[PDB]
Amino acid sequence: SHMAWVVDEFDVVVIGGGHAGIEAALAAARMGAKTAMFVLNADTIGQMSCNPAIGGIAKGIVVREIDALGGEMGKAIDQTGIQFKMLNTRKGKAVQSPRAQADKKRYREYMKKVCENQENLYIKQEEVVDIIVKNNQVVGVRTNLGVEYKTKAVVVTTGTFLNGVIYIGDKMIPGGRLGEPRSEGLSDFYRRFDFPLIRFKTGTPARLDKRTIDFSALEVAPGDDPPPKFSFWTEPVGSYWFPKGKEQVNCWITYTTPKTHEIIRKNLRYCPSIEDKIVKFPDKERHQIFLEPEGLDTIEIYPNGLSTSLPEEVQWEMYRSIPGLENVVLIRPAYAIEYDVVPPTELYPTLETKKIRGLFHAGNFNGTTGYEEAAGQGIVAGINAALRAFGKEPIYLRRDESYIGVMIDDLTTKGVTEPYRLFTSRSEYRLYIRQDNAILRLAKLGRELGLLSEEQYKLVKELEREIEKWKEFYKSERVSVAVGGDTRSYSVATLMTMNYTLDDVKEKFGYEVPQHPYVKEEVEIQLKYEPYIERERKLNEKLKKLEDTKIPPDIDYDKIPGLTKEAREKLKKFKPITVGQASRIDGITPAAITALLVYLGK
Amino acid sequence: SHMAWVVDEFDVVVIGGGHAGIEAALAAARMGAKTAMFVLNADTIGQMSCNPAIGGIAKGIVVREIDALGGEMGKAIDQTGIQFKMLNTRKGKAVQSPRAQADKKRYREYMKKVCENQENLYIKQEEVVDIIVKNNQVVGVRTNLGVEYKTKAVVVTTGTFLNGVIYIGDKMIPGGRLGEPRSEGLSDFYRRFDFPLIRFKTGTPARLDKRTIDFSALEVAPGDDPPPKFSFWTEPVGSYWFPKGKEQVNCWITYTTPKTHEIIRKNLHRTARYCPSIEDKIVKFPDKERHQIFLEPEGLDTIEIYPNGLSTSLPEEVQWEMYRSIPGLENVVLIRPAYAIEYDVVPPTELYPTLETKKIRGLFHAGNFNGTTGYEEAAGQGIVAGINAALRAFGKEPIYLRRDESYIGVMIDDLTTKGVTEPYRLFTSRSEYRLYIRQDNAILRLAKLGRELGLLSEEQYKLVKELEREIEKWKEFYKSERVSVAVGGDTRSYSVATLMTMNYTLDDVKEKFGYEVPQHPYVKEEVEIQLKYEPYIERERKLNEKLKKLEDTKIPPDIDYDKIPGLTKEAREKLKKFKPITVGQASRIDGITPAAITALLVYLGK
C-alpha cells in the first residue's frame, strides 16, 4: 500500500532535472525505457545556475559530441543562444572550440518542453530519499512522502543539492542553490552501503542590474559572423555554421583595480573565486571580467570573473571598485555552495557503480563542475541505465575517440581532489578529437543505440562517403607549381598542406569543390591535418595496443604471476576494463602491465 | 558598514514578488517612488501556485477594477490567457463576471518582464527578516545576510511563506510552497511589537499527466466567442471584447463517484465554513452523490492538468486511489502530489482601510498574509497598499476605496472591519450596490482616481472622458426620441430609453425603428446597459440613502471615544480597537448598536 501502482513502475529512474538528469532521462526514454525523472521543483528543470553560457575550450567539443550521440544540449543552445563565437581562432581550425551566450530563461523552458513531451518519460516532483536494493541490484526508490516506486536502474544526478550549504560571509544557509531547498535523506543510503562521501565547494558571482552599469568606456566583446552552431541537426541541417547575419548581442569587458585587491585583502589548485586568485597570484595587477547578459528580457548581468563568497556588505564595496560598476546595484548576492559527492572511483567507465548493479552516477554529484561535463556524463549514464533495464551490456566511451570518454576515464581512473573541469584534461589524440568531427566520431554509436533515427544517420553516411570521394580525388589530381626558380608537381591534397585552401585551389587552378558546406570544409580540414593525425597516431600506437586489450570482468588478479601485492591491491579496487585503462592507474608499473599482458596470453 | 549604501536606499520596500507584491511594487514605482521588491527566488515572480485561472464570480470584477486603476493583472491575463468566458450569461449583463484560463508559464514571464523593466523598481533576491522602526515609524529593513536597507515605507506580502508548513498525509515539510523554501525571521518582528498572529491553512489539487487521461467521454467546456477581455487597455483598446475567432483551448468536466467518497472515508481520521478540500466537503455534505470536477490545462507547452475540485492533503498513496476512481482518470499519473499549506497571518483588524498598520506608521500588509486567499484578492489589496506606501513616502495622505464604489473597497472594508476566522474569498462578500459595481463599468468607476494618482497617463484618461461624454450624449438622445408601440390592442408612446427596460436592445431599436446607434464598441454597449439598468440602479441608490449618509460622515483620526456621552463601555471598546474612519464603517462593526451610532452622530454635531 506504500508501493506505487503498476502504472507507476519504471525501467529507469533519473534523480534530478538538471543538466546530467535531462540527458540521462531523454536518452533512456528515447531508447524505449519507461523513465521517471524526479526533481525537487518541476519548474526548475533545465535551469542554468552559474554562467549564462554553453561551450568553451573543451566544453564546446563535448556539446558537439553530445549532439552527435543524439542528446539535446546542442539543439537547446542553437535555439536559445544569443551569441556564438569560435575560441582559439588564430591557430588553425583543429584547436578551436565553440562558445555561446544563452538566454537562460529560453534555455530552461526549451528543456522543460522537450522533457515534458518526450514519449515514455514522466516527470515526478518529489524528493528521493532512498534507493531500494536487493542482492546488490537496484529494484526501487523511496521518496520523503513515504512511497516507493519500482525501477530496474537508477541514475543519480543530485548536482549541488545533496546536503547543500550556501556560504555568504559567515552565514550558512541550507539549500542546493540560492533561494532553493536542498535534499538530505539520500546521503543515509550511501553511508548505509559504505560509499565514500566527500564535499566540494564552488562559487558564483552576484547578479547585477544592467541599468546601474556604465558601459560607455568598456570594450565590446561580440560574436562571430557567420556564427557557429552547436548542433548538426538544427537549421541549417548537416552543418555547423549559421547563416551570415544572424542576430546577436554583446558582452563587455572590464578589469579589477589595485583598489579592488586592497578591499579583498582588508576583508580576509583551480580556485576561480576572485578572492582566491589574488592570493594565489599576488602579482597580477588586474584581472579580466566579462559582463554577460542573462537573456533578452531580463536586466540581470553576470560578471564572469568575480565569483566570491565574501559578506554581502563587502561584495558591494568590491563590485563598486570595478570601472563601470561604480554605482552598480546587485539583484542577487554572490555565494559559494558545498554539497555531497561520491568519489568517481566508485564507478566503472560505464558510470555504473561497482557496489550496486543498476546504479549510475553523473554530474556534480560525480565530482565534476560545469553544465557540459555533467550533460556528457548524463547521456552515458542514461544510455547504460536503459541497457541494464533491457538486460543488455552497458557500453563506455573510449578516451581515444571522444572527449566525453577522456573525462569519464580520468574521473573513474584518477579520481578527484577538487571539482573536475574539462579544460584540465589532456587528450593524447587532440588532433583527431576535434570540434568539427564529433558527428563522424560518434554518430554510428548514436544510431546503433537508437538515439539517432535511420534518416539522421543516412545523412551522415552520405556526407562521409562524399568526403572520402573528394579526398581520393584531390589525392590523384596533380598540379605543377613554380616553387621559386624550380618547378614541382603536387597533388591538391598536398597543396592543403602548403597554405592553400580549397577556395584558393579553385580560384588559381580552376578545380571543383564540394558544394555541401560540411563536406567542403571537412575535406579541407582532413587533408590539411592528415600529416599530423598520422604522426599522432604513430606515436600512440602502443597506447592503441593496450586500449584494444580487454581484461576479463571475472579476472582474479591474485592468480597472476609476476604481479606485486601492492599492485593486485590497486588492480583489485579500480577493476580496469582494458590494459590501456589499467596502465593509467596512478601507481601501476610498466612491469605490472607486462605481467598482466603475459597472463592474458599476449 | 552593515548599512546599505545611498544607491541602495529606497522610498518603498515591498516584501514579496507574488500577486500582492507585484501590484504594490509596480504601483509605487509608477508613482515615482524608488522601490525595491524583495523575493526569495527571483525566478518565481508572478508565479501562479494554485488554479491556472484568473477571474470568476467576484474575482473577475476586481481584475477589471485593478486594470482601471492602472494595475497589471488585467493586462497580464489578456496577453497570456488561453481561454476566456463570461459567467452567469443567462441573467443579464449586470451579474456577469469574466473568467479566463491562464498559461501559467507565460503569465509568470509576463509579470517578471514587466517588473524587471519598470523604471524606479529594483528586484532584490533576499529574505527580509526584520523591519526597522523608529518611534513607531518605518525607517528600514534587514535581511538574513546581516544587512540593512533604508526605506520610508514597507509593504508586507509574504503570502503562504511566513513559517509555512506543507502537509501531506502525516508528513510535515517546511516550505512556503511545494518544492520551495519558507521565510521565518520576520515573525519575530511581529511578536516583538505585540502583533496578533494566526495560522491559516489551504489546500491545492495534484498536477496530472494529460497523456494518462481519457477525455473521450468527458464533457467539453470551451470559452466564449467572441471572448471577453480583462483589460480596457489591451487591443482592441477602449473595449472589453476580443475579436471573434480568437484561438482558445478547452477544459473538461468529470465527477466523483460513490466509490471516490468511500475511498476517502476509509482513510480519514478524526480531528477537532468553506472547506474546499474534497475530503472535507463530503463530510460536510454526506448526501451529495457526486461533485463536479474541472480538468484544466496549465498552458500550451505543458502536459500538466489541474483537477479543479480535488484539493486534498491526504497521503500520496491514498491520492493515487481517489484520483483513479474518477471517470477518465482510472490510469492517471501524478506529476505533483496534492497538499495543504499552513502559514502565518496578521489579523486584518490591525489595519485601517488604507491597509496601513495601526501600530506602525508606514507599514502596510496585503494578500494571504492579510487573511485572504486567491490571486485577485491579493492583487486588489496590493495596488492599494502600494499606492498608499508611495504616498506615505512622499508625505501625502493615504487613500482608501469606499465599499459603495468598488469591490476592492468591499473586500478591504470587510477585512478591516469584520476581521477573519478563515481565509477571506471575494464571493462571500455582499455589496449593497451590486447593480452599480459591475464588470462593465469598472473603468468608469475608478479611472479618475487612477489618473489622479499618476498610474494612468493623460492619454489614457482622455479616452475615458471622451467615451464618458459620448455615452451621456447618447443617453439624452434616446431619452428624447419617442416611438409608438402596440401593447396589445393599444398604442403607447415610449422613449427609446424606456424601450431598453421593455426587452428591446439597441440592435432591436435600429432594426425595427431605424434609429442610429453608437459606433464605438464600448459606448454602444455601455449606453444600453446604463439605460436597461437605470431603474434598478436608482431604486438601489434610494434604498441605501441612509448608508450613503453615514459613509459621508467622517470621523476625526484623534477622537477620544472616552469623551463621548451616551456611549456604552462595550461600544467604546470596539470603537477604540477598530478605529473607524467614517460613521458608515463604524456602523458595520459587529456589536455596535444603532443607539451607539446616534450618540456618535450627535457628538460629531449631526
Ligand SMILES: Cc1cc2nc3c(=O)[nH]c(=O)nc-3n(C[C@H](O)[C@H](O)[C@H](O)COP(=O)(O)OP(=O)(O)OC[C@H]3O[C@@H](n4cnc5c(N)ncnc54)[C@H](O)[C@@H]3O)c2cc1C
Ligand atoms: C553556487 C554554484 C557555483 C557553480 N560554479 C561553477 C563553476 O565554477 N564552473 C562551472 O562550470 N559550473 C559551475 N556551476 C554549475 C553546476 O555545475 C550546475 O549548476 C549543475 O550542478 C550541474 O549539473 P547537474 O546535473 O549535476 O546538477 P543540477 O543542475 O544542479 O541539478 C540537480 C537536480 O537534482 C535534483 N535533486 C537533488 N536531490 C534530489 C532528490 N533527493 N530527489 C529528487 N531530485 C533531486 C534537483 O531538483 C535538481 O534539479 C555552479 C553552480 C552553483 C549553484
Ligand SMILES: Cc1cc2nc3c(=O)[nH]c(=O)nc-3n(C[C@H](O)[C@H](O)[C@H](O)COP(=O)(O)OP(=O)(O)OC[C@H]3O[C@@H](n4cnc5c(N)ncnc54)[C@H](O)[C@@H]3O)c2cc1C
Ligand atoms: C497550498 C496552496 C493552496 C492555495 N489555495 C487557494 C484557494 O483555495 N483559493 C484561491 O483562490 N487561491 C489559493 N492559492 C493561491 C494563493 O492565494 C497565492 O498563491 C498567493 O499566496 C496570493 O498572493 P500573495 O501575494 O499574497 O502571495 P504569494 O504569491 O505567495 O507570494 C509571496 C512572496 O513573498 C516572498 N516572501 C515570503 N517571505 C519573504 C521574506 N521574508 N522576504 C522576502 N520575500 C519573501 C516569496 O518569495 C513570494 O514571492 C493557494 C496556494 C497554495 C500554495
